[PDB]
């Protein structure tokens, strides 16, 4: 009993010391420094394409490396691969279980993964010798439901399941290589680094941690949110990331200085945040709110600069393309739209 | 027109893909999807086993009856938070519920002051009054009745429910439990609760499920054309 008590008080003392060390390094906020710059007036974006054809809710989408192709997953059991320019479809990959919550597109354009509620990440092949698409691998090592998965490489994929863990897989062998543990709540968001060396995960209890894929250990942890985390995206520089939430608040953290920098909250929004993504130069922080419209929150000014209100139901996924030419938002009304 | 030779062929592929999507979209839209819920020892296995079968994580069960295709989703292996994956079941015809009558004198595991019947009542109150399941009816099943008879013939019901004036007979105790489960329904003008007592006859339960689904379909059709 006494050992547990001394361990708890030592942990509390270490947490307090970390808090004082984090407070001592704070001298000026981001708003005071970025006060002598010219802010953007208005960001008016008009829809260009309306990719229609789905027959149920849309839960995730990912842009290809060529900035031309995108894959979208829906509840009816389809994994259509659209063409952004001419609106045509390229594939109509069916699914085993019609309960999907994530999808990814390989950086080489060969494979496409799609997890879901069956806690199984299915990897499909698009460049087969035949004319159809086959299931190259079927990874099954998670207990809780799968939330999001991104391709670390053409042979390695990292997944974030609902059983408070994240794991790195090996498509060739079929078994996981490294298992990342430490989260207390459900992990439901992650994003890879530009150099593909580290990644962060967004838990379901007001927490975000930074992992390294080589050592498989927790380097830093970030707190400050109230309800939970719901979406994360890195800064194009690679030393910052923005975390959505459910209490109408998305904040910007920093890696070198493990401290919150700026929060984007408004008194008119009282609804959650489903998706967060940066821009090509890290100036516009698009956020997808579940009140049927998105936002174009500025990064260095913490003010709204536009509203993409052209949707019917809650938006659940959106991502800026690689070359920064257009954005795509997919909502629960089975309609994707390409803004520019 | 402005399209090249092989570009016109790529457009024809998109039309065939869309036609194949629309063909399969009209096949999965004519089958009844209904979710199955319950407690740990609520006898969901016996309920899903006594019915006819045609077919780790979600388990789907397919069966047909009177030219209708039913789908049974058994989300029992999901140990994660129910609040996160409950919005994908928004479009559903009914919600089967399983509760055990004989499970009222047996307390929870690793516990002594919490009763499992109260836990089942709390779960039903949380499911029926959820913000997503505001229009979907609920089919309620009382699994065990003979064991409940043998348990209540010797043990009084006042152990679980401290308010009870009737005798220690099953005829009124079943009605009391049913009425207690009916009162946990705030949305009294948008959904109904069909109660049935599970019997040894396998055909009767499937017939009751079919009747409830048909009544829900009739009500939805009446609400569709603005006639009700």
């Amino acid at each position: 009993g006494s050992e547990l008590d001394q361990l708890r008080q030592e942990a509390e003392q270490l947490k307090n010391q970390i808090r004082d060390a984090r407070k001592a390094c704070a001298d000026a906020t981001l708003s005071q420094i970025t006060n002598n710059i010219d802010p953007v007036g208005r960001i008016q974006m008009r829809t260009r394409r309306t990719l229609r054809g789905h027959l149920a809710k849309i839960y995730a989408m990912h842009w290809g490396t060529d900035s031309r192709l995108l894959v979208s997953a829906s509840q009816d059991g389809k994994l259509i691969i659209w063409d952004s320019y001419t609106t045509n479809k390229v594939h109509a990959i069916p699914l085993r279980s019609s309960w999907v919550m994530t999808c990814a597109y390989a950086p080489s354009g060969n494979y496409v993964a799609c997890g879901g509620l069956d806690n199984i990440c299915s990897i499909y092949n698009l460049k087969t010798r035949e004319g159809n698409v086959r299931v190259s691998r079927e990874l099954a090592g998670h207990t809780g439901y799968l939330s999001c998965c991104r391709f670390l490489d053409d042979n390695q994929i990292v997944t974030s399941s609902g059983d408070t863990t994240c794991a790195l897989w090996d498509i060739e062998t079929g078994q996981q290589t490294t298992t990342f543990t430490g989260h207390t709540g459900d992990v439901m968001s992650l994003s890879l680094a530009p150099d593909t060396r580290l990644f962060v995960s967004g838990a379901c209890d007001a927490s975000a941690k930074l992992w390294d894929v080589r050592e498989g250990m927790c380097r830093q942890t970030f707190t400050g949110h109230e309800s939970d985390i719901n979406a994360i995206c890195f800064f194009p520089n690679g030393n910052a990331f923005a975390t959505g939430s459910d209490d109408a608040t998305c904040r910007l953290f920093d890696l070198r200085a493990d401290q919150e920098l700026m929060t984007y909250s408004h008194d008119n929004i009282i609804c959650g945040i489903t998706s967060v993504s940066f821009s090509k130069s890290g100036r516009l922080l698009l956020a997808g709110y579940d009140d049927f419209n998105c936002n174009v929150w500025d990064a260095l000014k913490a003010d709204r600069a536009g509203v993409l209100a052209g949707h019917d139901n809650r938006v659940s996924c959106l991502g800026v393309t690689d070359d920064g030419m257009a954005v795509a938002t997919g909502s629960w009304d089975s309609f994707l739209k390409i803004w520019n | 027109c402005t399209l090249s030779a092989e570009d016109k062929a790529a457009v024809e592929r998109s039309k065939m893909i869309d036609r194949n999507l629309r063909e399969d979209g009209e096949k999965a839209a004519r089958e009844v999807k209904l979710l199955l819920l319950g407690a740990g020892e609520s006898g969901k296995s016996t309920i899903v086993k006594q019915m006819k079968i045609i077919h780790t994580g979600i388990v789907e069960t397919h069966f047909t009856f009177k030219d209708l295709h039913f789908k049974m989703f058994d989300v029992g292996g999901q140990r994660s938070e129910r609040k996160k994956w409950i919005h994908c079941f928004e479009g559903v015809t009914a919600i089967i519920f399983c509760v055990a009558l004989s499970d009222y004198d047996l307390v929870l595991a690793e516990d002594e002051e919490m009763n499992r019947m109260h836990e089942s009542m709390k779960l039903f109150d949380s499911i029926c009054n959820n913000k997503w399941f505001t229009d979907t009816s609920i089919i309620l099943f009382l699994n065990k009745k003979d064991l409940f008879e043998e348990k209540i013939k010797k043990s009084p019901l006042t152990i679980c429910y401290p308010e009870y004036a009737g005798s220690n007979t099953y005829e009124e105790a079943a009605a009391y439990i049913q009425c207690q489960f009916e009162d946990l329904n705030k949305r009294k003008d948008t959904k109904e609760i069909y109660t049935h007592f599970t019997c040894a006859t396998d055909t009767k339960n499937v017939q009751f499920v079919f009747d409830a689904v048909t009544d829900v379909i009739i009500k939805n059709n009446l609400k569709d054309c603005g006639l009700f």
Partner: single-chain antibody
Amino acid sequence: VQLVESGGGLVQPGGSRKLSCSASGFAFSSFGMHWVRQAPEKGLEWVAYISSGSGTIYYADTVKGRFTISRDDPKNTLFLQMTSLRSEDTAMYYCVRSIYYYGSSPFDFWGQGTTLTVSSSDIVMTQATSSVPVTPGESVSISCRSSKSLLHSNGNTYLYWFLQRPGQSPQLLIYRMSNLASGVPDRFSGSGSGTAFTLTISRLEAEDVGVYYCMQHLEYPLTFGAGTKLEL
């Protein structure tokens, strides 16, 4: 993947048999099929084409309204019927598949082909030369000139290139400008400007020798070249 053909022999002018081929090893229900006739010791030309699902069917201007063609999805068999015969129809027929979507490589696999003997505006593609002697291990450039700018408003050309091996069916090398097909070595390379096109080979061995053919695809009346032969 395998494509075998049957229904050829010695026939009299006026009536003939039916040319049928069987497909086995891929999804035949989602591939557009072509037909390429190769005259004896001469050049090869296009005959007909069927879209996926028999949606659009077209023929060549020489045999327009004289041939009958159709698909069969259940048994994966392609049929071609002759109505009237001439003294020039004696040639070797080939049945080649093709699929058209963003990033696809049409007619990557040709097949084997069958023989047939008979007892008795459009874009013009021309080759630079006919036959040139070459030593092993020497970089050769084969040029094919077009009569029309094949560069489309999209940004990609439609000049396909394939090598004919003596004794079997040809195989594709590059499909639009330089993108090598799956299975060909890295020695082959392609380049062009829109009217004049060239193909450069880095290392020349004894395993890659034959006749080179250049084909356009912008205008729908497909036309091939005369053929450049390589002599060892």
